[PDB]
Paper text:
Escherichia coli phage [name] belongs to the genus Kuravirus from the class Caudoviricetes of phages with short non-contractile tails. Here we show that the virion of [name] has a prolate head, containing genome and ejection proteins, and a tail, which is formed of portal, adaptor, nozzle, and tail needle proteins and decorated with long and short fibers. In contrast to other short-tailed phages, the tails of Kuraviruses elongate upon cell attachment. After binding to the host, [name] tail, nozzle proteins, and short fibers re-arrange to form a nozzle that extends the tail.
The central tubular part of the capsid is built from 90 hexamers arranged in nine layers of a ten-entry helix. The hexamers in the caps are more bent (H4, H5; 149-150°), whereas those that form the tubular part of the capsid are relatively flat (H1, H2L, H2R, H3; 154–164°). All hexamer-hexamer and hexamer-pentamer interfaces in the caps are arched (145°), however, the hexamers that form the tubular part of the capsid are connected by two types of interfaces, arched (145°) and more planar (160°). The arched interfaces enable the formation of rings of hexamers, whereas the more planar ones mediate interactions between the rings. In hexamers, the annular loop protrudes away from the axial domain. The six annular loops from subunits forming one hexamer form a ring around its quasi-sixfold axis. Nine shells of density can be distinguished inside the tubular part of the head, whereas only four shells are resolved underneath the capsid caps. In both five-fold symmetric and asymmetric reconstructions of the [name] head, the DNA strands in the two outermost layers are organized as ten-entry helices.
Numbering used by the authors:
A (entry chain K): 52 to 349
B (entry chain W): 3 to 51
C (entry chain W): 102 to 348
The structure:
């Protein structure tokens, strides 16, 4: 929900009757879950032996898989998939049911969640992933655009980065909307930008060193002209095509089926196991977090 | 009457109703907070310079 | 039904905040003083003979905004003009309402002045104004951060082996010794800059906001909120207004 933008210059006479106002309803969002899975298979013979630097081949392989699933999770929540699903306009399902895809079976397609990019003010799609070549829309009440395509006109075409000034433009958009974002998650390959704020054509807070035995060349904290103090964080599993401006409290992990133990059939010297868990992603407001894409310069 | 139980063939789907609503419209009002209030008794007020 | 309890109290709260949002925007919009009366304070004859008789067919009223109460120097209709400089103070030689010349930042971009801003502080100092605040829209706050160290050349803002980044300016000291304080306003227009002081502006309240239930005459359940207030300015030349114009 959001207040009305009918501020204008409302002026009323003294002796009139109360005229009907302009009321607008809320807006409902909806995201689907995704199924993660990691299978394990080890012959009984190998599981019976005693490896020279570990225990059984089953638990060791299970632990390796139990960690890979978490890595796959962090990479998907931070991806830009477009919530691939078959249903459409069936969330307020109260007047009837959806028998369009009811006479089907496991042949159904694979469901996908709405990643960071899809849940924000995305301007378009690319089949299954958010399109970065399009500038996102603006909020109805405010005029903020939390999805901005970096110009990079300051830097040349040799180095790409995203920009040095476009980082401050997002803080303006967030403040314009009222978001409380205080974290800037970035890929490690782009940290040289936030630390390498130089190359501004001889200006704009360049550099100096007082001939000291300490060379840092790092930037972790940031403050915008408005006063919003931001803290930069690095994530190895983040993509190298966008930057995220968000807040921890404005995100939540929706877990439907938690990872549990699943012993399957054998069929003869197989000893098959499996890991599986269904998880989704939520966002309190698409305009409560920023996404700064990356593009070339002039 | 589904034979293979799945999510898309269920006549139920009891929706999950979140217990909150998100709002970002700010009401800072820095000017009105620093001006000061003075009560009057006429639709028109005058001052001299 | 389920899930959707009520929409009456929820909407009242929404409207209770919207009415305040409008106030902060109207006082800083720049509208013109609208009224059906005129020169009815020195005739010492009566309130108004020609306006009487009309019960509710009168037209709405408008309060003199920040621009009207200042030395605007002309109107462009229902709102003050943002192009004509204000009239020069007769006593002094001050002009508190100016227009950005836009010397640098060629016409490719609108480019609010970013320079010659100390002239307004001069016009204020010339008018005895005690302005200490510079209310601006956040869309132009970067121009003040760049005033720190850009100078289209070598001024060399320094790191000194530090990781903290600030690049923010909120206080300025005029060459004449006038220390100002920059403040951001989300409801200010993107084509104006207000130099003023808080004590030089008062909020004239006549009818504080209050809720009042009206007649039903059915299942309407009608409610309303109403407040009558005004704006005051001690002296027009006690505050300044700087518009933005590229060319």
């Amino acid at each position: 929900d959001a207040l009305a933008s009918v501020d204008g210059n409302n002026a009323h006479v003294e002796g009139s009757r109360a005229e009907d106002g302009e009321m607008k309803p809320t807006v409902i969002k909806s995201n689907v879950t995704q199924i993660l899975r990691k299978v394990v298979r080890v012959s009984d013979t190998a599981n019976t032996t005693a490896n020279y630097g570990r225990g059984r081949e089953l638990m060791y392989q299970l632990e390796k898989k139990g960690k890979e699933i978490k890595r796959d999770l962090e990479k998907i929540l931070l991806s830009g998939q477009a919530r691939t699903d078959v249903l459409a306009d069936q969330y307020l399902t109260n007047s009837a049911a959806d028998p369009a895809v009811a006479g089907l079976n496991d042949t159904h397609a694979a469901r996908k969640t709405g990643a960071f990019q899809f849940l924000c003010a995305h301007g378009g799609l690319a089949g299954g992933v958010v399109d970065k070549t399009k500038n996102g829309p603006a909020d109805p009440d405010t005029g903020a655009v939390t999805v901005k395509v970096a110009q990079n006109a300051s830097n040349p075409t040799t180095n790409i980065g995203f920009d040095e000034a476009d980082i401050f433009d997002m803080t303006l958009q967030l403040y314009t909307a009222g978001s409380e974002a205080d974290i800037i998650m970035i890929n490690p390959a782009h940290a040289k930008i936030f630390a390498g704020l130089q190359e501004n054509t001889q200006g704009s807070r360049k550099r100096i060193f007082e001939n000291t035995k300490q060379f840092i060349y790092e930037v972790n904290s940031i403050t915008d002209p408005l006063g919003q103090s931001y803290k930069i964080i690095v994530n190895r599993w983040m993509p190298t095509d966008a930057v995220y401006f968000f807040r921890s409290a404005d995100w939540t992990q929706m877990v439907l089926r938690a990872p549990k133990r699943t012993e399957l059939a054998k069929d003869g010297s197989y000893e098959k196991w499996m890991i599986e868990m269904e998880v989704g992603l939520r966002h309190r407001n698409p305009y409560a977090s920023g996404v700064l894409f990356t593009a070339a310069g002039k | 009457n589904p034979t293979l139980f799945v999510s898309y063939d269920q006549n139920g789907k009891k929706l999950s109703f979140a217990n909150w609503i998100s709002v970002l419209s700010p009401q800072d009002t820095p000017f009105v907070s620093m001006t000061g209030k003075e009560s009057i008794n006429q639709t028109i007020f005058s001052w001299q310079t």
